[PDB]
Design a protein around this ligand. Structure first.
Ligand SMILES: Cc1cc2c3c(c1)[C@H](CC(C)C)NC(=O)[C@H](CC(C)C)NP(=O)([O-])C[C@H](CC2)O3
Ligand SMILES: [Ca+2]
Ligand SMILES: [Ca+2]
Ligand SMILES: [Ca+2]
Ligand SMILES: [Ca+2]
Ligand SMILES: [Zn+2]
Length: 316
């Protein structure tokens, strides 16, 4: 759409008010021209045909409940774009300012969110297991990072490589949640999962086993569902990433925490320079150690901690 850039205001899934970047051409659209080649949000109108209609509103106010998931998908995608640019100097997902697109209101009672190879897609949840998925900044950032990974390392979605792909999306989703300072934690999806129960989440990075996911290589799932356990075995890498950041003693192995910034710099470097489509856990460890080496020196404490953390989770 060609028009005039403006700013509208509305309310997100959790009922918080925010300003969002819109475009005006007869209607006001959810089109943000301030970021790269644009962020565009579409209505899939409960259907599965994509992308759907670019979102149009008559008065630049988005307070209807039907509007909530679109406000958030649009705003959170902006924040996520900002994180990548400000922290890692990367322009959008392909590093060349590609337009970021999302569709909300996909299907009926859809309890998931995903990246379809070209755009993000968000279900509204059935209202018991989930509420509209774009209300979780860690979820939106998990989705856009799959795009980042696909354009860089290209980790195949299965077995070990696939679990690394999933963990990268949880790690960066989590780093974005802290960047935005939105009540941050080391849990995934807490804000949109089981509105009826407080205190739970889909997965935990600080203690994966809390929901039955492995937290040590010896406990890796070796079966075939979930493409070989991509959302299960990610627990082992997420625990490693949590220890490199925060520190702790896990299975008798102590790790000194180096903090979140460094965690983010080391994994982004591993992802963008060293990993490949078929990389396995062991190769991820070599990548992470080399990245930390590049950045802080071989005899650094940073290198030391990346090593300790992998040892703690059993990855050699
Ligand atoms: C078993 C399975 C398969 C696929 C999934 C997911 C699980 C997982 C389902 C949710 C836990 C309910 N999806 C994800 O973890 C994320 C969404 C979270 C809310 C962050 N979606 P993905 O982008 O990983 C898409 C896949 C596809 C297949 O989700
Ligand atoms: Ca309106
Ligand atoms: Ca949180
Ligand atoms: Ca979280
Ligand atoms: Ca809950
Ligand atoms: Zn994922």
């Amino acid at each position: 759409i060609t028009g005039t850039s403006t700013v509208g205001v509305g309310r997100g899934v959790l009922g918080d008010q925010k300003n969002i970047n819109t475009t005006y051409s007869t209607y006001y659209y959810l089109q943000d021209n301030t970021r790269g080649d644009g962020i565009f949000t579409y209505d899939a109108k409960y259907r599965t045909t994509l992308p759907g209609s670019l979102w149009a509103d008559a008065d630049n106010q988005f307070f209807a409940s039907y509007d909530a998931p679109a406000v958030d998908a649009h705003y959170y995608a902006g924040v996520t774009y900002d994180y990548y640019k400000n922290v890692h100097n990367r322009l959008s997902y392909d590093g060349n300012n590609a337009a970021i697109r999302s569709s909300v209101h996909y299907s009926q009672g859809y309890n998931n969110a995903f990246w379809n190879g070209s755009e993000m897609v968000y279900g509204d949840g059935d209202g018991q297991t989930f509420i509209p998925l774009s209300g979780g900044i860690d979820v939106v950032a998990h989705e856009l990072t799959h795009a980042v990974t696909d354009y860089t390392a290209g980790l195949i979605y299965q077995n070990e490589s696939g679990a690394i792909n999933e963990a990268i999306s949880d790690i960066f989703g989590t780093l974005v949640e802290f960047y935005a300072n939105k009540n941050p934690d080391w849990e995934i999806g807490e804000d949109v999962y089981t509105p009826g129960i407080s205190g739970d989440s889909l997965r935990s990075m600080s203690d994966p086993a809390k929901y039955g996911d492995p937290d040590h290589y010896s406990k890796r799932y070796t079966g075939t569902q979930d493409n070989g356990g991509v959302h299960i075995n990610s627990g082992i890498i997420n625990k490693a990433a949590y220890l490199i950041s925060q520190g702790g003693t896990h299975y008798g192995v102590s790790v000194v925490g180096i903090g979140r910034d460094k965690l983010g710099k080391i994994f982004y470097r591993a992802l963008t320079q060293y990993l490949t489509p078929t990389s396995n856990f062991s190769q991820l460890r070599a990548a992470a150690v080399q990245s930390a080496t590049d950045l802080y020196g071989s005899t650094s404490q940073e290198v030391a901690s990346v090593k300790q953390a992998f040892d703690a989770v059993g990855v050699k």
